[PDB]
Design a binder for this molecule. Structure first.
Ligand SMILES: [Ca+2]
Ligand SMILES: [Ca+2]
Ligand SMILES: [Ca+2]
Ligand SMILES: [Cl-]
Ligand code: NA
Ligand code: NA
Ligand code: NA
Ligand code: NA
Lengths: 4, 473
C-alpha cells in the first residue's frame, strides 16, 4: 503493498 | 455577521473561498453555521502529529489508534527524510484550527480529528481491517489517501477482513446509518493507471474523489475511471497554487499535492454536511454528492450527459464538490429507501474476445420482485475473463439510457496474463437512471497484436431503489  | 478566519495563511487557501468561483464554496457553508462541530473524522495514514499547534485544539484520541505498533498513540515516527508527514498534512486539510494565528484552517475547522497510524509498516489485510473498523460508533468519517501501487499494472482490492470491515461499517457503523469512507482515487496518471483496477476506490462503500488543478484541468497524476464520484481541487503545475496544511514538526506547508490532498478536503465537506443533518445514511451522502457537484469550468475531453441530464466525466465524476450546496440540500433531506440489489447473470456460454466482443442483454432489473430497481445507484459488471496481455483491453458498458461508461481503458504497462477473476468494475455514471432495457458490454483489443482470450462470466449487479425520482436536470 500500500502506498501513500 | 459571519467573519471569515483570520489565520495568516487563510488568504492562500484559494480552494476554500475566492471571488473567482474556482473554489469549493466552503465559506458559504461556514456562513450557514456549519463548521464541523460535533463531527469526528479519522485520517487512516502514517500517523498524526497530535500536538501540532494547528491540530491540538481539535485532536480526538477516541478517533485515533496506532495499528502499526498496537498502542493508542498515533504520533508519527520521526525520521530525517520526514517520511511520516503524510497523515499530518491530510489531517490539517480536514480540521486545522481556525482563528488561532497559526497556518490556515481546515474545511471543518471545528470538527474533531484523529489519525490511525497504519501505513508505517507492513500493511496487511488485518491492519486495514482494524483501521477501517476503528471505533465505528464514535468516528463518523474515515479518510484514506493511500491504496495499491499506481504502477499501471496492478489489479488489487481489499482482501477478506478489509471487505468485511467495509460491510460492517456501512451496515452497523454510526448507529446503523453507516460509516462514511472517503478515498483518494489515485496518483497513477503518468502510468496511465485506471482507478477501476483499485478495489478500494472501485468499491460502492467508498466515495472515490479525484483532483482538479487551480486552472480547472486534469492534473498529471489523475487517474480516470467510472467509479469516481466527485472532485476537489489539488495541485497542478508550478504556476498553479497548492494546498495549505499542517506539516510534520509543527510546521506549516503550502505545497501539499496530489490525489492525497483531494480526499481530506472531501472528508471535511462531508463533515460539514453531517453537521447539517446527522441522520444522513452512507447512501444519502453519495446521493447528495451526485446531486450537488458542479462540472462548470472543469476542463475534460470526455464530459457526457447521462440519462437523467447530469454531466459526468471519468476524470471528475459529477464534478467539483460544492460545500454550500451540500449543507443546504442536507437540511431537509428525505432518507433514501433501503438499498435493493438485483443480480443478473448475463452469459449463457463463454465468448471468445478476439479483436472485439460485444455482449447485448435486455434486462428487466428484477421486475415483479422486492429487489426491482427503477432508480439505479451503483452498477457493477463483474467480469471473469482470460487474456494474454491484460493492458491491451478496453472495456465499456452502455446503459439502456445510452450512458457509455469506460470500465477499463488501455493500460500500456499492464503486461499481465492473469486476466480478471470476477472483478467488479463499477460505474457511478448511470446514477438515478432506470436500468430496465438493453445493456451493452464491449471488450476490445486496443493494440495491433494478435491477442486472445475468453469471457467466461459477466454478472451485471445493479444497486438502487424504486421510488423518489427527481425530474431530470
Ligand atoms: Ca504509537
Ligand atoms: Ca489555524
Ligand atoms: Ca491507481
Ligand atoms: Cl452487496
Ligand atoms: Na444499517
Ligand atoms: Na468507491
Ligand atoms: Na429502459
Ligand atoms: Na438500443
Amino acid at each position: 503493498x500500500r502506498v501513500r | 455577521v459571519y467573519q471569515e478566519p483570520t489565520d495568516p495563511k487563510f488568504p492562500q487557501q484559494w480552494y476554500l473561498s475566492g471571488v473567482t468561483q474556482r473554489d469549493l464554496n466552503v465559506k458559504a457553508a461556514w456562513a450557514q453555521g456549519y463548521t464541523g462541530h460535533g463531527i469526528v473524522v479519522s485520517i487512516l495514514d502514517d500517523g498524526i502529529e497530535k500536538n501540532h499547534p494547528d491540530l491540538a485544539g481539535n485532536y480526538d484520541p477516541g478517533a485515533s489508534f496506532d495499528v502499526n505498533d498496537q498502542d493508542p498513540d498515533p504520533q508519527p515516527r520521526y525520521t530525517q527524510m520526514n517520511d511520516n508527514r503524510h497523515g499530518t498534512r491530510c489531517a490539517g486539510e480536514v480540521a486545522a484550527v481556525a482563528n488561532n494565528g497559526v497556518c490556515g484552517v481546515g474545511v471543518a475547522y471545528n470538527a474533531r480529528i484523529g489519525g490511525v497510524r497504519m501505513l508505517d509498516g507492513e500493511v496487511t489485510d488485518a491492519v486495514e481491517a482494524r483501521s477501517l473498523g476503528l471505533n465505528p460508533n464514535h468516528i463518523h468519517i474515515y479518510s484514506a489517501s493511500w491504496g495499491p501501487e499506481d504502477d499501471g499494472k496492478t489489479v488489487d482490492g481489499p482482501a477478506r477482513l478489509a471487505e468485511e470491515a467495509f460491510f460492517r461499517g456501512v451496515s452497523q457503523g454510526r448507529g446503523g446509518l453507516g460509516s462514511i469512507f472517503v478515498w483518494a482515487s489515485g496518483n497513477g496518471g503518468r502510468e496511465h493507471d485506471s482507478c477501476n483496477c483499485d478495489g478500494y476506490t472501485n468499491s460502492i462503500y467508498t466515495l472515490s474523489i479525484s483532483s482538479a488543478t487551480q486552472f480547472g484541468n486534469v492534473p498529471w497524476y489523475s487517474e480516470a475511471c467510472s467509479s469516481t464520484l466527485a472532485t476537489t481541487y489539488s495541485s497542478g503545475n508550478q504556476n498553479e497554487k497548492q494546498i495549505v496544511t499542517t506539516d510534520l514538526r509543527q510546521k506549516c506547508t503550502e505545497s501539499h499535492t496530489g490525489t492525497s490532498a483531494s480526499a481530506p478536503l472531501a472528508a471535511g465537506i462531508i463533515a460539514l454536511t453531517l453537521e447539517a443533518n446527522k441522520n444522513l445514511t452512507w447512501r444519502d451522502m453519495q446521493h447528495l454528492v451526485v446531486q450537488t457537484s458542479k462540472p462548470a469550468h472543469l476542463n475534460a475531453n470526455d464530459w457526457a450527459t447521462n440519462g437523467v441530464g447530469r454531466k459526468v466525466s471519468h476524470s471528475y465524476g459529477y464534478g467539483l464538490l460544492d460545500a454550500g450546496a451540500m449543507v443546504a440540500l442536507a437540511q431537509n433531506w428525505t432518507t433514501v429507501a433501503p438499498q435493493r440489489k438485483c443480480i443478473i447473470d448475463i452469459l449463457t456460454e463463454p465468448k471468445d474476445i478476439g479483436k472485439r466482443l460485444e455482449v447485448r442483454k435486455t434486462v428487466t432489473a428484477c421486475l415483479g420482485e422486492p429487489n426491482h430497481i427503477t432508480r439505479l445507484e451503483h452498477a457493477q459488471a463483474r467480469l471473469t475473463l482470460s487474456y494474454n496481455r491484460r493492458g491491451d483491453l478496453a472495456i465499456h458498458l452502455v446503459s439502456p439510457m445510452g450512458t457509455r461508461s469506460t470500465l477499463l481503458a488501455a493500460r500500456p504497462h499492464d503486461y499481465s496474463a492473469d486476466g480478471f477473476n470476477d472483478w467488479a468494475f463499477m460505474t457511478t455514471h448511470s446514477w438515478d437512471e432506470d436500468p430496465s432495457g438493453e445493456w451493452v458490454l464491449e471488450i476490445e483489443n486496443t493494440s495491433e497484436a494478435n491477442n486472445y482470450g475468453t469471457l467466461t462470466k459477466f454478472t451485471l449487479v445493479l444497486y438502487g431503489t424504486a421510488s423518489g425520482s427527481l425530474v431530470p436536470r
